[PDB]
Amino acid sequence: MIQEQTMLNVADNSGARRVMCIKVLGGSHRRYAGVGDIIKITIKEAIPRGKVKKGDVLKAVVVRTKKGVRRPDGSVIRFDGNACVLLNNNSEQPIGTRIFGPVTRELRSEKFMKIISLAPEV
Amino acid sequence: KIRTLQGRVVSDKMEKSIVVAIERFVKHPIYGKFIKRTTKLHVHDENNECGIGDVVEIRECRPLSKTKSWTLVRVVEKAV
Amino acid sequence: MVTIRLARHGAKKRPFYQVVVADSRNARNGRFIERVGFFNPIASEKEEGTRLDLDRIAHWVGQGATISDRVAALIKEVNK
Amino acid sequence: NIKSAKKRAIQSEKARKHNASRRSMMRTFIKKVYAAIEAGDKAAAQKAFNEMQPIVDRQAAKGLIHKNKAARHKANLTAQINKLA
RNA sequence: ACCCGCAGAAGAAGCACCGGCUAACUCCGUGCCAGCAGCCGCGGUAAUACGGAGGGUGCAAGCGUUAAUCGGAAUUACUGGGCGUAAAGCGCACGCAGGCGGUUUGUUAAGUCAGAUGUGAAAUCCCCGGGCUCAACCUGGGAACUGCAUCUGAUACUGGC
RNA sequence: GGUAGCUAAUACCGCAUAACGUCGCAAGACCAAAGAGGGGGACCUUCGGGCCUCUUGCCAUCGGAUGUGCCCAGAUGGGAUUAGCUAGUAGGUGGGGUAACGGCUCACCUAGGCGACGAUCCCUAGCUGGUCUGAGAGGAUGACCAGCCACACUGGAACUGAGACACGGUCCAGACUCCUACGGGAGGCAGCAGUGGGGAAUAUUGCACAAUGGGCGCAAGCCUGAUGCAGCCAUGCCGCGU
């Protein structure tokens, strides 16, 4: 499960295999992150085709978990990687032009549908 | 008749092939001195009668193999 | 098809035209077998204007290359 | 409008299911003729080669192997039955 | 296109340069300041060097400034460089692989010289016939492109034997 | 645009016939396909053809004409403070492959092959007709132009056809732009033109199937940002005003 000091691959286009989870947020004491809810990330490698800097502090949201999406019936829909997508801290919204993720029901429960819907996978 | 060139054998170390050196002897285009511009060719030889120091006469086909288009006509000096 | 045809030649508002034998196949005025004449649509109303090698064309037609309506009518300008 | 080149891969794969299938049949026919030389000799080989002869010409009549390979196959095997003693 | 008329000096001129080399130059103001300069160098009370002014010089629908290429440039040197010092000759001995080598004969023909047949695309130079005055351009006929290959002589020199 | 029911061939396959082709000294066996159109009389009918006539096609064999595939030779940017380099590199044995060649592509035996005439490796790069310069030699350089070789957003495979190693194609993938109120979907201006960006900088989303060519059609005719012409600029050259 995703938590503080976890290294992940990123769902943002031209993002590197390595970004670091520095805070799990929620204001109260928190163990692990949650799908469709925010997390604090630092960029540990930057790709020159991408739009981010190494060592920069950013806002993100969790978009796929090895724990799967499973609330309504207990029937799990599962993925073979843990990943988040990057959000702007003032203007809001996913900062990329493509997302590498399943873009499930709880991501369309956010204000983001216009920039995630190019490829629905479930 | 046919066109043939003269040379000397520089390697025989290959089962059905030999290597021959030929001298085209050409004038330098600016400074006018004549230069050998010696060229080493691989030559087809199934009869295998030659060795280091033999003077030979050769002809072109047809490409016989990769980097080989010449074949042996006659042995010229038949010395030693 | 080897054809006897008119080739693109002239100036802005002043076309001149040449006639050549070529397989087509080949592109515009290039890579032709031989030239046989020139048209000049004006020809300055003179007998030293417009020329056609009617005897070499006679050896290139038969039993030879094709000649279409507009090119078979060049003989009518030299008349002949 | 059209671009008939967009039809030619489909027209080739639909035909491949016979036009390449017969290449496998023809590769096999060489085996049937060499198997008739061990069945064997002059009283089996030239009788069995005459099962292959018309099929090679009947394929060449449609194109595909017409430029040399069809006549090449017939000549190659005519020379192999002529070699018999 | 071309022809005929209506039209009135009417609508039409620049930019650089002038101490010595270097064409044309004097006076004002500034007073080592400001503003200049291809090199020699300008400016403190005559500035022919700045800015202006009056007169000249140059080219012209152009005139001028630059980072640069060719000329001047034989100062990159083949046509056609240089090594005592001015800048380069190794402190010295021997020598493989390279370059070079007397002379009488024959022979090979790589190389040279001679003669042909193919080819060296079309534009195009140059000669020259048309088309617009000249010409750019479209061309009609010529020429050259010393080349290269394939056949064939000379048989002298060089390499080879 | 997918599927199913239905129906015909100048769409398709067999059964026939078949040359100087196949292979051989040779007799000889074998492989194929389409009619159509305009005109037109006697005889006959259910008078949307029996039948005559010319044209043009269809299937095959073998030559010319012209290309396409292949390998060489002479010509050829820099670097030696790169001196050694290499394992399909270098030779043989056997298959397969192509219209055809070769290691061309494989599997195995052999260890040679290439170097101071610079191998090996690395940087730079459309080439030549041409262009400018000066008396020329020589130098600096190859826009446009004619021809030739390569390229089609970035990349692989090659297929069709007479031909592409396919600007306006296939299977798509990558980087993407655009559409979707959200269930998957179209495409590649280094064509013709504008525009965002890059730059000290290079012209208009001009007019027209009028002429010409190519393409289909037996021909009338239809298609054509091919092409043919405008528009703008001291940017170079030439004749000429004020």
From Swiss-Prot, chain A:
Pfam families in UniProt: Ribosomal_L14
User: In the UniProt record, does the keyword Acyltransferase occur?
Assistant: no
Q: Which GO terms describe its cellular component?
A: cytoplasm; cytosol; cytosolic large ribosomal subunit
GO BP: any one term: cytoplasmic translation
Gene3D superfamilies, alphabetized = Ribosomal protein L14 (2.40.150.20)
Q: Name one GO molecular function term.
A: structural constituent of ribosome
Outcome of swapping K114A: Reduced RsfS binding
**Record-linked SMART domains:** Ribosomal_L14
Per UniProt, the keywords (alphabetical) are: Ribonucleoprotein, Ribosomal protein, RNA-binding, rRNA-binding
Q: What does this protein do?
A: Binds to 23S rRNA. Forms part of two intersubunit bridges in the 70S ribosome. In the 3.5 A resolved structures L14 and L19 interact and together make contact with the 16S rRNA in bridges B5 and B8.
How this chain assembles, per its entry, is: Part of the 50S ribosomal subunit. Forms a cluster with proteins L3 and L19. Forms two bridges to the 30S subunit in the 70S ribosome, contacting the 16S rRNA. In pre-50S ribosomal subunits interacts with RsfS, which may inhibit association with the 30S subunit.
Please report which protein family the annotation says this sequence is part of. Answer: Belongs to the universal ribosomal protein uL14 family.
Spell out the protein name for this chain: Large ribosomal subunit protein uL14
UniProtKB/Swiss-Prot annotation, chain B:
- GO MF terms, alphabetically ordered: rRNA binding; small ribosomal subunit rRNA binding; structural constituent of ribosome; zinc ion binding
GO cellular component assignments = cytoplasm; cytosolic small ribosomal subunit
Report the domain of life of the source organism: Bacteria
**SUPFAM superfamilies named among the record's database cross-references:** Nucleic acid-binding proteins (SSF50249)
Query: Which GO terms of type biological process are on file?
Result: cytoplasmic translation; response to antibiotic; ribosomal small subunit assembly
**InterPro entries documented for this protein:** NA-bd_OB-fold, Ribosomal_uS17, Ribosomal_uS17_bact/chlr, Ribosomal_uS17_CS
Q: Supply the PROSITE patterns for this chain.
A: RIBOSOMAL_S17
Keyword line: Antibiotic resistance, Ribonucleoprotein, Ribosomal protein, RNA-binding, rRNA-binding
Known partners and oligomeric status: Part of the 30S ribosomal subunit.
PANTHER family associated with the record: 40S RIBOSOMAL PROTEIN S11 FAMILY MEMBER, SMALL RIBOSOMAL SUBUNIT PROTEIN US17M
- Additional information: The strain missing both S17 and L29 grows very slowly and has a rather unstable temperature-sensitive phenotype.
Q: Which HAMAP family match?
A: Ribosomal_uS17_B
Q: Which family does it belong to?
A: Belongs to the universal ribosomal protein uS17 family.
The name under which this protein is listed is Small ribosomal subunit protein uS17
Swiss-Prot record, chain C:
Organism, scientific name: Escherichia coli (strain K12)
Q: What is the lineage of its organism?
A: Bacteria, Pseudomonadati, Pseudomonadota, Gammaproteobacteria, Enterobacterales
* InterPro entries (UniProt xref): Ribosomal_bS16, Ribosomal_bS16_CS, Ribosomal_bS16_dom_sf
Q: NCBIfam families this protein is in?
A: S16
What is the name listed in the Swiss-Prot or TrEMBL entry for this protein? Small ribosomal subunit protein bS16
**Per UniProt, what is one GO molecular function of this protein?**
four-way junction DNA binding
Annotated PROSITE patterns: RIBOSOMAL_S16 (PS00732)
Query: Partners and quaternary state?
Result: Part of the 30S ribosomal subunit.
* Upregulating conditions: Part of the rpsP-rimM-trmD-rplS operon.
Swiss-Prot record, chain D:
What are the entry keywords?
Ribonucleoprotein, Ribosomal protein, RNA-binding, rRNA-binding
The processes (GO biological process) annotated in the record are: cytoplasmic translation; ribosomal small subunit assembly
What SUPFAM superfamilies does the record tag this protein with?
A: Ribosomal protein S20 (SSF46992)
User: Which region ranges are annotated with the description Disordered?
Assistant: 1-24
InterPro entries referenced in this protein's UniProt entry, alphabetically:
Ribosomal_bS20 (IPR002583), Ribosomal_bS20_sf (IPR036510)
Gene Ontology MF terms in the entry:
ornithine decarboxylase inhibitor activity; small ribosomal subunit rRNA binding; structural constituent of ribosome
Record's Gene Ontology CC terms? Answer: cytoplasm; cytosol; cytosolic small ribosomal subunit; small ribosomal subunit
Summarize the subunit comment: Part of the 30S ribosomal subunit.
Family membership, please give it: Belongs to the bacterial ribosomal protein bS20 family.
Q: What does this protein do?
A: Binds directly to 16S ribosomal RNA.
Q: What is this protein called?
A: Small ribosomal subunit protein bS20
Q: Supply the source organism for this entry.
A: Escherichia coli (strain K12)
The upper taxonomy is: Bacteria, Pseudomonadati, Pseudomonadota, Gammaproteobacteria, Enterobacterales
